[PDB]
Amino acid sequence: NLQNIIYNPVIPFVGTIPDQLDPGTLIVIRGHVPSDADRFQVDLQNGSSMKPRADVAFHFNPRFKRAGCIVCNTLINEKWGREEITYDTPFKREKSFEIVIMVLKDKFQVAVNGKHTLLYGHRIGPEKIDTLGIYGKVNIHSIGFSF
Ligand SMILES: CC(=O)N[C@@H]1[C@@H](O)[C@H](O[C@@H]2O[C@H](CO)[C@H](O)[C@H](O[C@]3(C(=O)O)C[C@H](O)[C@@H](NC(C)=O)[C@H]([C@H](O)[C@H](O)CO)O3)[C@H]2O)[C@@H](CO)O[C@H]1O
Ligand SMILES: [Cl-]
């Protein structure tokens, strides 16, 4: 079932993932976007090194300026790849949310508040993911895993 690794963590949060993200694994993140929020990110990482900066297999980046959007990308050897921008974003300032990330064989599937939001094909073997980090202006109520 779901095994939360932490509640109301101080942001930025960087934690180690208890088990390998094998296809079928779910990542559940419940939080809230503060009214003065410009953006925030959830990064599935390979290690928690800050320098050199640890690779980010999956960069889930909601942005709030203008109409808003969600930028997804991958950071390999401290270099960002091709961005995959999703314009149909459900995130809003002053609103709560539950993010469910499904780890499939060839990609991540993300749904927010029960509604499908986006897909992102693996650019790095998901098996190299052992750390989860949450940065930016966002309040997190919980982070859990379903292996
Ligand atoms: C072409 C275009 O649309 N403009 C891009 C612009 O999107 C891009 O912004 C960066 O986008 C990546 C994802 O592709 C990340 O979202 C970057 O966010 C972070 C990061 O994690 O790297 C957030 C982090 O907090 C920032 N660190 C600091 C010091 O505050 C870093 C940092 O500012 C940048 O890495 C410096 O380059 O960004 C987000 O900045 C930019 C930069 O790649 O390039 C335009 O062309
Ligand atoms: Cl797949």
Half-sphere exposure of 90 (CA within 13 A, CB side): 14
In angstroms, rounded to a whole number, what is the distance separating the alpha carbons of residues 10 and 7? 9
Q: Which residue is associated with the tokens 């963590």? A: 9
> How many CB atoms lie under 10 A from the CB of residue 43?
22
How was it solved? Answer: X-ray
Amino acid in the structure at residue 129: I
Angle, CA 8 vertex, CA 7 and CA 9 arms, to 5°: 90
Cβ of 131 below 6 Å from ligand 1: no
Per the structure block, which two tokens stand in for 115?
Answer: 């509604």
CA of 34 to the centre of ligand 1 (A): 21
CA of 39 from ligand 2 middle (Å) equals 28
Assign 41 to helix, strand or coil.
strand
Q: Is 80 in the pocket of ligand 1 (CB under 6 A)?
A: yes
The resolution in Å comes to: 2.1
The domains found in the chain, sorted by start residue, are: 1-147 (2.60.120.200)
CA distance 4 to 15: 12
